[model samples]
Target: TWLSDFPQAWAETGGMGLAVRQAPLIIPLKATSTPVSIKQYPMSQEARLGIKPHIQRLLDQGILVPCQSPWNTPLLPVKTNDYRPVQDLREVNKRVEDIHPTVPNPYNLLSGLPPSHQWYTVLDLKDAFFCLRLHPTSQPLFAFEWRDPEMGISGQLTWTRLPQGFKNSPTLFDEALHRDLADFRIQHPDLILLQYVDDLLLAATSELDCQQGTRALLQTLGNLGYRASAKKAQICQKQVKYLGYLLKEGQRWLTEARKETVMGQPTPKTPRQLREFLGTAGFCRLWIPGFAEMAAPLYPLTKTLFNWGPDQQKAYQEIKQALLTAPALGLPDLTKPFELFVDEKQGYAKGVLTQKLGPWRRPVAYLSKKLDPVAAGWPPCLRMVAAIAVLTKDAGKLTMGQPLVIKAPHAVEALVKQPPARMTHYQALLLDTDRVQFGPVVALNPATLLPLP
Candidate 1:
């Protein structure tokens, strides 16, 4: 059993717990290459108590650094890679969204994100498999020795450091590659490189700058033994699929393949089918205002009866209409001030933040939440809890320490900032709300200042 600082080993095969002296987060393993490192503290304390943190560490250490393209300094594609079929997927993603309107997607942020830059080059490593190396002596360190024969010797023994088949492996691999790519860009700040694993997209204001950055990236990748497919690479393209969306110089749209898949699906017949369809199609809801309310009718089909009727059909049609018009979202213009529109009705609420797209309310994102029915009649203190939850679940790193604006339809902001003038029997208990200890809560908006009790 490998040792770790925690009492138990990670959920994976190996772990080592060391004191701060022995646990330098990043250590030099190879003089030329980057140094090895230990695991950082978990993002959430919930994961720290368990073995998942150890597994996360092992997986991070195993990612292969991307190789540079051997074909050209910066790849430039001569012809289309069958553009017709690519459009099909974009349609599919849209149609699929029509069938099942509700389920939240963890990867929803990828939808409608325009290319980070106008002129960009997306880089890819040729075949990472042929280039990876694990010295014989270091094999045991990555032995992945959790299986039959105990030696971890087999044709199936993939990922000598940590196998790629594991569920968390992709996240680990992608994060580490992103870090390395970020470090490389730091040395050359004139360009922007967004990486999702070995694949990289280099974007810049000028074609010359984009190409220069691509050249640097090629040199860097080649030095690391990763190579790009000479025949398949493109440089300084006006538009191409970066992460999931097709990005054009000024045009942004969904992938054809996704659209086609969505448009192709028949109306779902089962609850499971509805879930699967929604999981695939609900990505663009960021462009759809009142998405939760729009999806409310369809949500019941999944958890309750299998009956699909006019409400389901109407919901499906409405979602498709929303997608066809799929609101255009743009990057913030540093020159302009931001404008926000917010409104709440009954148990449903909708809000949007916007800026002048030359005078159009080009949506940043359409946000909505369902208020607690029982809490609707409760006093301001009680409704505050539900409102706080709506604001901060996925605010991202940029908003990490920023204040969230809370507009109460019935109460004033002062209610949250100061004590009330008089107190009921229950209100006296609210005065001491700050004395309660924090628990499972990760974050809260300005509204949720009361104690957990």
Candidate 2:
């Protein structure tokens, strides 16, 4: 039904492929680095046959050209049977000038969208990097070697179009598309557009608005020569996947596939495996309260020798179980004020950021870290102050320009009102004695004090 309105955008079953562009990609080289040419690695007959047609297609599209340069990288086939060539550009990336990564922060970007944006659509640009051409002078920097085993033909080639695997490809494509779509912000005030590299997510308050916005977006992209994958284009859905998370209405959650990845993991038997488990589980730490406490047993194992004990096994199972039942985290609604909960324990501090939604104060984020030994030794009152200071500083962006209600440990409420000179400089600066209204922890509901189940 949603597709009925956007006939022009959906005429084809798949993405329209790379769009034509005027300028070649510009790769700046570091002044001191010298070019190095590496010989091609051998490949099987099947591999050569698989790549040959894709190479011919690139040649036809003017995406590749004959070239000889001191820089050469091997082309490897993708893991699947598909003949798609993966350019190994690590060597070239090492010598090239580094560009600033312009990828948007997923946290802040998702937060910026209003809760009313209930309907969503996502468009993934087809062959996003290939849409841009590379400058001739810089093209040779991406040179690669290939041979046809059947015909006994061999030669050197370089990409005329921007190739993936290069360090700057994502940055370059993102900036270009951002500039191209800048006008839409003003043109469609009711619509929200968030881009990370080539993937575009569009959100709107209503299904009709989403359809209209999606049509306008696709039309503009078509006019500009960008092809979007129709298969990946999720049209006018209430729930959509973006940046690996499932977003619906005002809440976000980990997808079932991702949850299973953690649930199915084998228990760590080595220090490396333990670190791997921690790193994987840490991404969704906000959903699990007292995560640092749960992870305490495993942290020591990473720094010290691997001694498989009952404590470590308990911790591993506890973390995995917590992740399986983790609840959705509410994305911050910028129009509303935020409430901060601060707590200080024997050796660590914790903070939870929340906003009043309906009848409940839903959590927007969680922050916690173990204190240094010196700070842990501070008086309980000072430790409370330190907790508030660290959380305020860490979540400053969310708190800035927002009225704040801070709930601190019950004992230190009055002390926060009249600060002592003994407070650290950071404590004084962030504690803003006047702007924040201090309340005792008793004012917060007991259920609010506990982590979400």
RMSD of each: 17.9, 3.2
Tens digit of per-residue lDDT, candidate 1, span 23-134: 1121112234321222222122232224333333444654322222111111111222321100012211221112222322223333313334588777665433323333
Q: How close is candidate 2 to the true structure, as a TM-score?
A: 0.89
Q: Relative to the unseen true structure, what is the C-alpha lDDT of residue 180 in candidate 2, on a scale of 0 to 100?
A: 80
lDDT of 2: 0.77
lDDT of 2 at 451: 32
Full-model lDDT for every candidate: 0.45, 0.77
Q: In lDDT terms, which candidate is top? A: 2
Top-TM-score structure, candidate number: 2
Question: How do the residues 155-225 of candidate 2 rate in per-residue lDDT, one tens digit apiece?
Answer: 88888878889898888999988888888767999998998888889999999999889889987787677
Query: What is the Cα-based TM-score of model 1?
Result: 0.56
Assess the local accuracy of residue 52 in candidate 1 as a C-alpha lDDT between 0 and 100: 33
